Amino acid sequence: MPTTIEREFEELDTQRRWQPLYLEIRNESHDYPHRVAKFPENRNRNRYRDVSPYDHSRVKLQNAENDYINASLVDIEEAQRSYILTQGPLPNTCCHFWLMVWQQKTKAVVMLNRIVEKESVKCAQYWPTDDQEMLFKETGFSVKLLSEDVKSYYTVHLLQLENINSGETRTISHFHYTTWPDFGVPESPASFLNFLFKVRESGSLNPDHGPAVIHCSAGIGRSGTFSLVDTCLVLMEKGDDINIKQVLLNMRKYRMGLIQTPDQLRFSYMAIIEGAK
Ligand SMILES: CC(C)CCN[C@@H]1CCc2cc(O)c(N3CC(=O)NS3(=O)=O)c(F)c2C1
């Protein structure tokens, strides 16, 4: 029979209620303090003045003079899942990004943007593209490209993250979705689901590892879409119904503006429907 989410989707589609439902979410999302992001010392650590992590859920850099990073811990207790959603690193925050990855014991970095989108740099080149070692002297980290697996719409880079201070190294999986435009959607629910199931298959979203770092340019539109679909598919496993609107409103309490367009909200519904099959 048509599932409850399938009927909710059919109702929104035939009644053309996507733009009003998105506006409902926007007006029902409560604002939370983000005073630390706005400190004058952190102005050069933010990529967008209107995108800030909340004080109650920001990720702190441990043992640092300035513990600030534009990253949020998004916890979904019910789904047994936590992520770090962050902006695409700036040239001066690449060292903080790698320090965060180490401290949080992250195993995978999920990248949903391209470095250059619509005539603008949306992210720094924070990982090496060749055999040259990329050095982050501020925090004491090295990154070396170990291998690259190129697919039509995504690439997986294996990276060696060296902590020079401790002499330890770790293998990080860098899942780069290369065909998801800024403020746009992936070309199909199947391509997004195949990429999502590749990240899951690696164990990087499990509780035996630290939270996976999900980023696009601002860390809210495409990262929000990816995270909602993944969380809703886990909540779906208990045979219950999910109020997608409420799960998104709950996620928006950890990081502001998750899902930036009504078409990204519609895509989240199609992907959750096809995923649960
Ligand atoms: C929190 C909210 C009120 C701020 C709303 N203004 C900011 C303006 C700058 C900006 C730039 C982006 O590239 C994007 N992305 C769109 C997408 O699909 N993924 S993304 O996060 O990289 C933004 F969402 C925003 C939103």
Residue numbers in the entry: 1 to 277
What does the paper say about this structure?
The phosphatase PTPN2 (also known as TC-PTP) and its paralogue PTPN1 (also known as PTP-1B) are negative regulators of several cytokine signalling pathways and T cell receptor (TCR) signalling and therefore act as crucial checkpoints of inflammation. PTPN2 and PTPN1 (PTPN2/N1) dampen inflammation by dephosphorylating members of the JAK and STAT families, positioning them as negative regulators of signalling through interferon (IFN), interleukin-2 (IL-2), IL-15 and others. PTPN2 also targets proximal TCR signalling molecules such as FYN and LCK, thereby dampening antigen sensitivity in T cells. Here we present the discovery and characterization of ABBV-CLS-484 (AC484), a first-in-class, orally bioavailable, potent PTPN2 and PTPN1 active-site inhibitor.
PTPN2 and PTPN1 have highly homologous active sites; therefore we designed molecules that optimized interactions in both PTPN2 and PTPN1 through structure-based drug design. Subsequently, partial saturation of the naphthyl core to obtain the corresponding amino-tetralin and optimization of the amine side chain led to the discovery of AC484. The crystal structure of the PTPN2 protein with AC484 confirmed the formation of several crucial interactions in the active site Cys216 region. The highly acidic thiadiazolidinone dioxide moiety made up to nine interactions with residues in this region, including hydrogen bonds with the Cys216, Arg222, Asp182, Ser217 and Ile220 residues. We additionally sought interactions proximal to the tetralin ring and designed the isopentyl-amine group to further engage in a hydrogen bond with Asp50 and a hydrophobic interaction with Met256. Owing to the high homology in the active sites, corresponding interactions were also observed in a crystal of AC484 with PTPN1 (data not shown), which resulted in low nanomolar biochemical potency for both PTPN2 (IC50 of 1.8 nM) and PTPN1 (IC50 of 2.5 nM). AC484 is a zwitterionic compound (NH of thiadiazolidinone dioxide pKa = 0.9; amine NH pKa = 10), and this feature proved pivotal for its observed properties, including the distinct combination of low plasma protein binding (86% fraction unbound in mouse plasma and 50% in human plasma) and low clearance. The combination of optimized properties and ligand–target interactions of AC484 drove low nanomolar enzymatic potency and significantly improved cellular potency (STAT1 IC50 of 176 nM in B16 cells). Additionally, in a biochemical phosphatase screen, AC484 demonstrated high selectivity for PTPN2/N1, with 6–8-fold weaker activity on PTPN9 and no detectable activity on SHP-1 or SHP-2.
